[PDB]
Amino acid sequence: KVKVWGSIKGL
Amino acid sequence: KVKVWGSIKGL
Amino acid sequence: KVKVWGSIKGL
Amino acid sequence: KVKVWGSIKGL
Amino acid sequence: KVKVWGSIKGL
Amino acid sequence: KVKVWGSIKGL
Amino acid sequence: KVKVWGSIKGL
Amino acid sequence: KVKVWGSIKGL
């Protein structure tokens, strides 16, 4: 399993 | 702010 | 599946 | 207010 | 697909 | 910034 | 075990 | 950039 997390830069 | 969360399908 | 949500800063 | 919603294609 | 919709605040 | 972490299933 | 890590380009 | 590294279990 590969987790993805964060926020889109500039938005 | 635009959040991102989940997992990569097939991994 | 990687979900995306929120709102654009400053708008 | 400008909302954002969806999922990243291919993931 | 990541959808974007709304209106610009103050305009 | 959207980060990724995990391991490939079955390996 | 095969680890996966980093960040998605362009985000 | 999403790096991958390790070894296959049992081999």
CB C6 to CB A11 under 8 A? yes
Indicate the SS3 state at residue A11. Answer: coil
Give the pair of three-digit tokens for residue H11.
């081999």
Write the burial class of residue D9 (CB in 10 Å: 0-12 exposed, 13-18 middle, 19+ buried).
exposed
Give the pair of three-digit tokens for residue G2.
């095969």
Method used to solve the structure: X-ray
Q: What is the spatial distance between Cα B11 and Cα C7, in angstroms, rounded to a whole number?
A: 29
SS3 labels along chain B: CEEEEEECCCC
Nominal resolution (angstroms): 2.1
CB B4 to CB A2 under 8 A? no
Give the pair of three-digit tokens for residue F9.
């299933």
Interface contact C10, partner B, CB < 8 A? no
Residue D1's Cα: distance from chain center in Å? 16
Which chain C residues are closer than 8 Å to E5 by Cβ? none
